Coordinates of C-alpha atoms and ligand atoms in Angstrom, one line a residue:
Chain A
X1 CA -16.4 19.9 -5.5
X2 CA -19.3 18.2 -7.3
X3 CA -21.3 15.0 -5.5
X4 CA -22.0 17.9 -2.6
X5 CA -23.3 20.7 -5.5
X6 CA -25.9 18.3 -6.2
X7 CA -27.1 17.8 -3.0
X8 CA -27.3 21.4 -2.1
X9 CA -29.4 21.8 -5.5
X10 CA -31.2 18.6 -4.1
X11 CA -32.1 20.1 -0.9
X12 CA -33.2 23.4 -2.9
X13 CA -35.7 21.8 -4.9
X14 CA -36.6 20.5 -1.4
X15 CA -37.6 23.6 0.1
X16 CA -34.7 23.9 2.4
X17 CA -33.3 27.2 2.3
X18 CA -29.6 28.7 2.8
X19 CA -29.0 30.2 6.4
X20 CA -26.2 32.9 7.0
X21 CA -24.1 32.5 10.3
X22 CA -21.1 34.4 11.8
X23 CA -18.1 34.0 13.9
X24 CA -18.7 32.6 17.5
X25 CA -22.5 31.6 16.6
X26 CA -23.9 28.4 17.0
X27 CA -25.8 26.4 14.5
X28 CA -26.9 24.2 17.0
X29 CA -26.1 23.8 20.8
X30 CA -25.4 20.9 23.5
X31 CA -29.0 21.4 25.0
X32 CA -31.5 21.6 21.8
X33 CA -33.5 18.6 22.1
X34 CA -34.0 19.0 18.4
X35 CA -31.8 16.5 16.4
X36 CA -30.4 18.2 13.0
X37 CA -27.9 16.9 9.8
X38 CA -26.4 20.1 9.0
X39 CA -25.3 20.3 5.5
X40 CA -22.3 22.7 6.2
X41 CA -22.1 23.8 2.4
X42 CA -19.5 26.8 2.7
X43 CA -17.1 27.8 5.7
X44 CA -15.2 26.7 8.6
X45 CA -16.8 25.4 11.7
X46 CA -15.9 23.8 15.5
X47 CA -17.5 20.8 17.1
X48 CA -16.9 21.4 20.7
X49 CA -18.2 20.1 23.9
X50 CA -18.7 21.7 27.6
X51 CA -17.7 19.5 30.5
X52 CA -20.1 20.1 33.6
X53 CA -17.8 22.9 35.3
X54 CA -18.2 24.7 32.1
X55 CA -14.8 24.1 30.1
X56 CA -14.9 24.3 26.5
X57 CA -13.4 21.2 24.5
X58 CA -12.4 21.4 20.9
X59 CA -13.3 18.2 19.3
X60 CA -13.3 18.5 15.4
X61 CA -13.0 20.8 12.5
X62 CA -14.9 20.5 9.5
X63 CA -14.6 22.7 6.5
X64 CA -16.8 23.8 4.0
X65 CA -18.9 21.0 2.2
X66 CA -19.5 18.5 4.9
X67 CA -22.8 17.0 6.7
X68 CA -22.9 17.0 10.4
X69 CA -25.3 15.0 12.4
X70 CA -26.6 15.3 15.8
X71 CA -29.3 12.5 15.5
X72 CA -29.0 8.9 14.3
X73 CA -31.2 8.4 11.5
X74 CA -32.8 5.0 12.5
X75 CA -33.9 5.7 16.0
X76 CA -33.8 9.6 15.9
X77 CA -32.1 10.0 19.6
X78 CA -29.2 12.0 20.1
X79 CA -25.6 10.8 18.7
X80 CA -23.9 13.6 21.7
X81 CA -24.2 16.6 23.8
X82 CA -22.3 18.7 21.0
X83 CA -22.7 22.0 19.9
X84 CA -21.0 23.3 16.4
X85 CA -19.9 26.5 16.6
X86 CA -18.5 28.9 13.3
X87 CA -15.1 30.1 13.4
X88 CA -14.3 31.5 10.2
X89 CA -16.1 34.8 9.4
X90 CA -19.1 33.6 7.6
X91 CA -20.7 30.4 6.7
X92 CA -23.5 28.9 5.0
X93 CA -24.8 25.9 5.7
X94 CA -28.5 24.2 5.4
X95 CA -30.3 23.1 8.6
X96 CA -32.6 20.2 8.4
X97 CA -34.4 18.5 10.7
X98 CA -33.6 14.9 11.5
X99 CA -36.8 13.4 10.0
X100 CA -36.9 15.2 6.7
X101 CA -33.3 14.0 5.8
X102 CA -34.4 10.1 6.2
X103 CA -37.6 10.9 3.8
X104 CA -35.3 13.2 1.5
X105 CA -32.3 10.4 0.9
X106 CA -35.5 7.7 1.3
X107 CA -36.5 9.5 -2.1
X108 CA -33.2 9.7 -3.2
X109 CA -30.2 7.2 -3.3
X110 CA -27.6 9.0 -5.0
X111 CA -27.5 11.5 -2.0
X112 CA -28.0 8.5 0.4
X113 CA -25.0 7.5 -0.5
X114 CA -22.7 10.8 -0.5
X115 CA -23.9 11.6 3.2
X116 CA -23.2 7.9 4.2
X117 CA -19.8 7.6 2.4
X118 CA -18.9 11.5 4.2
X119 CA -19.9 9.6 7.5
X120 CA -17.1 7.2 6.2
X121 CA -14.9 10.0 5.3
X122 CA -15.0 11.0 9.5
X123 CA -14.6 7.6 10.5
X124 CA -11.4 7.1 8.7
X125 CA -9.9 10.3 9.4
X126 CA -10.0 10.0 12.7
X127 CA -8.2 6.2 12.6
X128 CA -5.4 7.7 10.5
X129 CA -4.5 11.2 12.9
X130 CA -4.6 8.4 15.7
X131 CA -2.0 6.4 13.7
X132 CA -0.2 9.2 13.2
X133 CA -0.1 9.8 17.1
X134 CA 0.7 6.5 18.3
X135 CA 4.0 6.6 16.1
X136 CA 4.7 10.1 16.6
X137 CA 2.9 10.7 19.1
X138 CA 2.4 15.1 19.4
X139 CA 5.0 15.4 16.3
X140 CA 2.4 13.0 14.3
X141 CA -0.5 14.8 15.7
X142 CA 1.1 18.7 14.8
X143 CA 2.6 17.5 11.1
X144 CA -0.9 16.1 10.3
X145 CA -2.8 19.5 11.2
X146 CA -0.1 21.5 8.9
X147 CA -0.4 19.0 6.3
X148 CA -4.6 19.1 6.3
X149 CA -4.0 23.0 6.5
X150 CA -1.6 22.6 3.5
X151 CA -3.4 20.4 1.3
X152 CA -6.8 22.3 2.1
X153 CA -5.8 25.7 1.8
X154 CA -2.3 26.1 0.5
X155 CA -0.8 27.3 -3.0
X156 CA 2.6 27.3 -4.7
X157 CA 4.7 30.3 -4.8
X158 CA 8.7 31.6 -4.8
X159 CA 8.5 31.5 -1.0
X160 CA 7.1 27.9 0.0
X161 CA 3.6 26.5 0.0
X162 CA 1.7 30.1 1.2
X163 CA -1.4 28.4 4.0
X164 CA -4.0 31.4 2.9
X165 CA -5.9 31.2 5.9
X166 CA -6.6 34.5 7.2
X167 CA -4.7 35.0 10.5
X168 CA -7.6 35.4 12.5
X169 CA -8.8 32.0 11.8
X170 CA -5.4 30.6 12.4
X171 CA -5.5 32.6 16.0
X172 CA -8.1 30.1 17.0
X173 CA -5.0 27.3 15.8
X174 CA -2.0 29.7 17.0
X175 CA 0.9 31.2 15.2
X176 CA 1.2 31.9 19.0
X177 CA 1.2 25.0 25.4
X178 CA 4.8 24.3 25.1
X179 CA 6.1 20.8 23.6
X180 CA 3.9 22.2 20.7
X181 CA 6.4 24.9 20.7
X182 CA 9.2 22.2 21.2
X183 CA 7.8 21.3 18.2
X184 CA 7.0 24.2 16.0
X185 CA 10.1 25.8 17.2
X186 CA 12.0 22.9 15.8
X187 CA 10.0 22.7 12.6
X188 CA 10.6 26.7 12.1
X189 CA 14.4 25.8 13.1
X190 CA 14.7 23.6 10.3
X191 CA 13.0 25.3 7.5
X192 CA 9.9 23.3 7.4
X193 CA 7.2 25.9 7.9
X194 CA 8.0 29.6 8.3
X195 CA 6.8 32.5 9.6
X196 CA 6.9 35.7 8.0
X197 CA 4.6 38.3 6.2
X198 CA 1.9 37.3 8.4
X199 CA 1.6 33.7 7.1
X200 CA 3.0 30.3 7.7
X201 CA 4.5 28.8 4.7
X202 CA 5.4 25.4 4.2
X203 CA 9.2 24.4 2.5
X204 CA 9.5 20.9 3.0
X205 CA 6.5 19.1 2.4
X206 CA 8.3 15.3 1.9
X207 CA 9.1 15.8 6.0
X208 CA 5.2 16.3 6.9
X209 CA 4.4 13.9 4.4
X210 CA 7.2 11.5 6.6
X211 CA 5.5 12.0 9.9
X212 CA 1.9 12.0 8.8
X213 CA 1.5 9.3 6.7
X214 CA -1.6 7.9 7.3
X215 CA -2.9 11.0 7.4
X216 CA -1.4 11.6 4.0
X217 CA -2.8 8.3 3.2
X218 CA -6.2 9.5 3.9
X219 CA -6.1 12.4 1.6
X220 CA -5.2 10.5 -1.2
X221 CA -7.6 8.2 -0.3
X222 CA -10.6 10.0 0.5
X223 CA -10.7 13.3 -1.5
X224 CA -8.2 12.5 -4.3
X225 CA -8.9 16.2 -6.7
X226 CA -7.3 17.8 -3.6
X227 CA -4.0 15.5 -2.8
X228 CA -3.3 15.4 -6.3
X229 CA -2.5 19.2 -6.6
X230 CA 0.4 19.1 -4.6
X231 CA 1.7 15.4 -5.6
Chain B
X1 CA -29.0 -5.6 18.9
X2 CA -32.7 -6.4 17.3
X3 CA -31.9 -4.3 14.5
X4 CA -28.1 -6.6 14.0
X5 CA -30.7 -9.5 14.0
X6 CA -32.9 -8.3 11.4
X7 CA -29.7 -7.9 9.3
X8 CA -27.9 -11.4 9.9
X9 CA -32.1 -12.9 8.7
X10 CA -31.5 -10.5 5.9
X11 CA -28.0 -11.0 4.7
X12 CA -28.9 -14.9 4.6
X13 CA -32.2 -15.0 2.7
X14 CA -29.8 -13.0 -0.3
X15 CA -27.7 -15.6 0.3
X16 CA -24.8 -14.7 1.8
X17 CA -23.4 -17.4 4.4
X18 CA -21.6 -16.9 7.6
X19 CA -17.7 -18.0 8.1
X20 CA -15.6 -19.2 11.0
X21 CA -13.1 -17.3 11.9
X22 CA -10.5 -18.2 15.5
X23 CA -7.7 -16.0 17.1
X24 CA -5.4 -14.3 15.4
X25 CA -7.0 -14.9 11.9
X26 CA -7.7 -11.4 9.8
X27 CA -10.6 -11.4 7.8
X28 CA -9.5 -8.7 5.8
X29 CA -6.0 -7.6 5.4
X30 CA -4.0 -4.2 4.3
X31 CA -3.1 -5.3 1.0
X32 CA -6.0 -7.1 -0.1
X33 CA -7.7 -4.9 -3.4
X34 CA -11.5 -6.4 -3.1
X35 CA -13.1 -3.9 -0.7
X36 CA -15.8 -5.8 2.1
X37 CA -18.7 -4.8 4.3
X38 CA -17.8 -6.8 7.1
X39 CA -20.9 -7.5 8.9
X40 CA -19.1 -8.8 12.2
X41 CA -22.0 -11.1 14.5
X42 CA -20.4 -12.3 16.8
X43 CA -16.6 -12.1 18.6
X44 CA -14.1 -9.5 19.5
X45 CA -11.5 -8.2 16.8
X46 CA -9.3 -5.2 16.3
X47 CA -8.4 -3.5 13.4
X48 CA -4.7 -2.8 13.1
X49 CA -2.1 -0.4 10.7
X50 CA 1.3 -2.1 9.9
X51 CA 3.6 0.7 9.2
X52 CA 6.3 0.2 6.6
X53 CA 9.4 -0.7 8.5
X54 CA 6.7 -3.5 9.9
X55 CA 5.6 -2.3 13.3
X56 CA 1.9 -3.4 14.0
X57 CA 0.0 -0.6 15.4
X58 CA -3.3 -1.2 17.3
X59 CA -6.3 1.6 16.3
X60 CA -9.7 0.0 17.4
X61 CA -11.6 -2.8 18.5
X62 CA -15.1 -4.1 17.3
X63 CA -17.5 -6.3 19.3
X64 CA -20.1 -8.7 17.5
X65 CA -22.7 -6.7 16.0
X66 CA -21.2 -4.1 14.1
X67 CA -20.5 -3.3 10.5
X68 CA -16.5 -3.0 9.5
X69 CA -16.6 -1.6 5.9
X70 CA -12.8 -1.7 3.7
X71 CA -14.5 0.4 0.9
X72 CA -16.5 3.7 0.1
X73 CA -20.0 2.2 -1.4
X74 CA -20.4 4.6 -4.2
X75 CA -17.1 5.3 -5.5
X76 CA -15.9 1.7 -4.4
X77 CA -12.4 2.8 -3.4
X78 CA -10.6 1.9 -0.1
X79 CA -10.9 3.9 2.6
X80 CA -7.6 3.0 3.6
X81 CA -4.5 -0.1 4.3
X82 CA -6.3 -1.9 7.5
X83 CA -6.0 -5.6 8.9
X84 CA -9.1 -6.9 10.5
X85 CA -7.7 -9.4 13.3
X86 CA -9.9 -11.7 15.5
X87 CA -8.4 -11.2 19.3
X88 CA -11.3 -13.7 20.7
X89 CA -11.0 -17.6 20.9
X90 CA -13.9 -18.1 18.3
X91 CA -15.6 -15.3 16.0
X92 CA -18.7 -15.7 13.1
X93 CA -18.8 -12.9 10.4
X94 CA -20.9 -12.7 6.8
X95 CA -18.1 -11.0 4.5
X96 CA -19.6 -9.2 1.6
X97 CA -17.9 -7.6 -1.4
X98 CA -18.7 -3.9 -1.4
X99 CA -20.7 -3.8 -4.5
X100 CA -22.6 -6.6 -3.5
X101 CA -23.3 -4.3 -0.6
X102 CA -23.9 -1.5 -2.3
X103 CA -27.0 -3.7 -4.7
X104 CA -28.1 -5.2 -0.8
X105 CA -28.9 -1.6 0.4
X106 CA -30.8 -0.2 -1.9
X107 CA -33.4 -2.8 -1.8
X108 CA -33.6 -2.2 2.0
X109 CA -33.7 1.0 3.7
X110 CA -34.7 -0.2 7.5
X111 CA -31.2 -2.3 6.5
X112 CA -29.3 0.9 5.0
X113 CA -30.3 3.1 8.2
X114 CA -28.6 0.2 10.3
X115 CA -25.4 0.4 8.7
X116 CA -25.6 4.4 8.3
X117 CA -26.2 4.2 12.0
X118 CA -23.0 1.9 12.6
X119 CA -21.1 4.8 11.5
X120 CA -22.7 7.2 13.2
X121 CA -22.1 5.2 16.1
X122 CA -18.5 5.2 15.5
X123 CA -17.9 8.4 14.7
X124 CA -19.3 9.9 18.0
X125 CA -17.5 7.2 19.6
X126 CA -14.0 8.3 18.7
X127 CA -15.0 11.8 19.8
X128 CA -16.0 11.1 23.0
X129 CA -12.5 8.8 23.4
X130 CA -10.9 12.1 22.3
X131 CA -12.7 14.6 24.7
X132 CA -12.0 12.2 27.7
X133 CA -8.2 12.1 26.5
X134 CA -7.8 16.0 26.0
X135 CA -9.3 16.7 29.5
X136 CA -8.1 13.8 31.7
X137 CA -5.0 12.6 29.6
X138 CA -4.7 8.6 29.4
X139 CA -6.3 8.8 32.8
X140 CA -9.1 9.6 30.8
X141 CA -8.3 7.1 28.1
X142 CA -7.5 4.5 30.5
X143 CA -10.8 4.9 32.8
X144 CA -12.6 5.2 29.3
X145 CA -11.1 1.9 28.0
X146 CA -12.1 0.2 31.8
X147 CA -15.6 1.5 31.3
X148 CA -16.2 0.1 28.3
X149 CA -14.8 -3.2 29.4
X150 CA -17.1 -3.2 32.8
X151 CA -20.5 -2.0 30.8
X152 CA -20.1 -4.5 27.8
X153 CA -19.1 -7.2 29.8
X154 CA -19.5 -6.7 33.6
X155 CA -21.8 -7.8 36.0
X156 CA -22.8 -7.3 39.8
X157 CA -21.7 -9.8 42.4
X158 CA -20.4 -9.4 46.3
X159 CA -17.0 -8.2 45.2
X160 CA -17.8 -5.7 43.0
X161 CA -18.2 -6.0 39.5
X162 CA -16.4 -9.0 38.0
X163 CA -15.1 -8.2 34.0
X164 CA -16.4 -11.4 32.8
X165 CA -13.4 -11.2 29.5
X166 CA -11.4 -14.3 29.4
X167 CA -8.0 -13.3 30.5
X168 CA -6.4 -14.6 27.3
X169 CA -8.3 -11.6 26.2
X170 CA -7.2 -9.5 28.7
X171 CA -3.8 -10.0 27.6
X172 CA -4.8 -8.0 24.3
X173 CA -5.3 -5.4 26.5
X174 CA 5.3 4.7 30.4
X175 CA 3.1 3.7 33.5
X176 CA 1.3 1.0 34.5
X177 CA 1.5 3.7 37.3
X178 CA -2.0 4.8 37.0
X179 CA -3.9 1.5 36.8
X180 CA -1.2 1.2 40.0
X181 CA -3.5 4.1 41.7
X182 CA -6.4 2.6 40.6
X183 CA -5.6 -0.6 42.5
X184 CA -4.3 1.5 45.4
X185 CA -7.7 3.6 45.7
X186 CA -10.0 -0.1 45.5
X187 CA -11.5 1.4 41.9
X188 CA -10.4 -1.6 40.6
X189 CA -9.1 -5.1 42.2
X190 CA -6.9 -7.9 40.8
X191 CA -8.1 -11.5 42.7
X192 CA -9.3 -14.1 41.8
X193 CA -8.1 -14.2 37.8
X194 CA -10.4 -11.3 37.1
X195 CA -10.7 -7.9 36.6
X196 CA -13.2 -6.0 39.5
X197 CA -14.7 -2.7 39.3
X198 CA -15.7 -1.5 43.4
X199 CA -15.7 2.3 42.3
X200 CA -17.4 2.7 38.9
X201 CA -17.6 6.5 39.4
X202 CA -14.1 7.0 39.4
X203 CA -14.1 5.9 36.0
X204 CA -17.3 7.7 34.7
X205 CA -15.4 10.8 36.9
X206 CA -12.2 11.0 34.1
X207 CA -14.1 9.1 30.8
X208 CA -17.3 12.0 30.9
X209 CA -18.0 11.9 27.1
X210 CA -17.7 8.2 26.9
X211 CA -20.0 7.2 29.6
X212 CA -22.4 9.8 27.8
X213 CA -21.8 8.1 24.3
X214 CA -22.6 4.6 26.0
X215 CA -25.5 6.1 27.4
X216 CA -27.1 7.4 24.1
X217 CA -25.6 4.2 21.7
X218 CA -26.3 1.2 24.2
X219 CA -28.9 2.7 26.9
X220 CA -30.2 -0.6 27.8
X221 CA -27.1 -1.7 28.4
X222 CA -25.9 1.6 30.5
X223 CA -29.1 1.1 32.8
X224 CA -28.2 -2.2 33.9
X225 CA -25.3 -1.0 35.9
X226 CA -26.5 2.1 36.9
Ligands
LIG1 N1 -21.4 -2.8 19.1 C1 -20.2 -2.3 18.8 O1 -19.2 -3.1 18.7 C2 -20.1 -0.8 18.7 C3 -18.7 -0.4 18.2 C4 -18.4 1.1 18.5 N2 -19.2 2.0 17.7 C5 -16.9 1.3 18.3 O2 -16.4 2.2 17.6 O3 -16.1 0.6 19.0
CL2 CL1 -10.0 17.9 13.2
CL3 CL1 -11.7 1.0 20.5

């Protein structure tokens, strides 16, 4: 959508070119003492986090027109020891230093205001998935992730809402940990979401909806163009 | 916070005041349509979710200075059904509608970074509470949520460090099982109405990414214990 074309022809005009990246690369690392805002234009990416004996933490998930910050703006000091790596099979995205970002929304408030209302976006999101999970605790948290995976990438036909995330993608969140399966066993069980032409579909909608409704909230809330297709 | 400081001088020479608010008063609430920028100054609060059959949920807690904001500035739209509940005895706070917000920041951009920072700050914040909990569990989120409460509001003395929250606070706050092992091990220590920390690294050990987050959003702070 829109708000985020104009910043990518903003940023353009700017001098700041495209980059390409590829599955498992990293845009920017844990240890790079250089702060970025990565303007993640188009794919899928992973913000993860290494503990000190070297285990690898999934944190968040953004998708395909989304800043990302490692800096704070005001002081220019790290915001975390992250490092966002791409999952899907390509991306694009725009990598700016910290600095030139304050000067380039400095110059110009329409943008300053789409990056800080995205920053609002995160904020909220977060507060309604933990909602979600301290109703329904891992049954909140799992209907939540189908219904962003449903909203974001799913399309009506005969059989169910098809998710049209290629299954490699949704390897690294698994067709297939075992309450999950509890879970998704009971889900499949009860003609929720099912598996079969290799792709989860999704036949009752009103249930996720039920059990993520914060989350569902959110959507409707925050990015309204995308909720309304399937409402 | 210097930066909070320069903000309360500049919210009142554009004329906005500051209100009183005392314990269990919401400054905002969930079905309220005029959006706010809730500069919060001074006091403790918690923002809470009531779900439809009525059950209040708890989601996070703000200290004075910080930025609570209802609305999305540009579009002007909520960013979702929240209460905004003061949990301390006494708590000041400049409430601003969101447009007025919207005018206030672009006149100001030392202001505008503050705020954008605010988020920033809370964003990483929730990410860190969420790596601690994926590794560790609610060992992790408990130690995290101890942390907190000893760096913002501990201090050194012979017994350890005393969590200097009035109780009635503390009362905000299955198993009590683990803060059990935590009193077993002398991490923590119940006398004399207070809260005592005599192991901080057991609760930097199991809340990693929060300690580091403290550590990069309130150094100054961080240094002072460590
Ligand atoms: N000074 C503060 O209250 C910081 C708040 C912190 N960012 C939080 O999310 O709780
Ligand atoms: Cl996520
Ligand atoms: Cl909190």
């Amino acid at each position: 959508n829109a708000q985020a074309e104009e910043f990518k022809k903003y940023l353009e005009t700017n001098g700041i070119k495209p980059k390409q990246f590829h599955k498992k690369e990293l845009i920017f690392n844990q240890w790079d003492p250089q702060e970025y805002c990565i303007f993640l234009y188009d794919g899928i990416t992973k913000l993860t986090s290494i503990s000190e004996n070297g285990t690898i933490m999934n944190l968040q998930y953004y998708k395909g027109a989304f800043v990302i910050m490692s800096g704070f703006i005001d002081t220019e000091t790290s915001v975390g020891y992250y490092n966002l790596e791409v999952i899907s099979e390509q991306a694009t995205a725009y990598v700016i230093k910290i600095n030139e970002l304050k000067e380039l929304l400095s110059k110009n408030l329409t943008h300053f205001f789409y990056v800080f209302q995205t920053l609002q976006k995160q904020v909220s999101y977060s507060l309604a998935k933990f909602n979600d999970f301290s109703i329904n605790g891992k049954l909140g948290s799992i209907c939540g992730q189908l219904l962003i995976l449903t909203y974001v990438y799913g399309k009506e036909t005969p059989d169910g809402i098809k998710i049209t995330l290629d299954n490699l993608t949704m390897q690294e969140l698994g067709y297939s940990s075992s309450a999950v399966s509890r879970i998704i066993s009971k889900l499949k069980q009860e003609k929720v979401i099912v598996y079969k032409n290799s792709c989860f579909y999704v036949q009752n909608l009103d249930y996720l909806k039920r059990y993520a409704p914060k989350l569902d909230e959110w959507f409707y809330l925050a990015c309204p163009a995308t909720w309304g297709k399937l409402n």
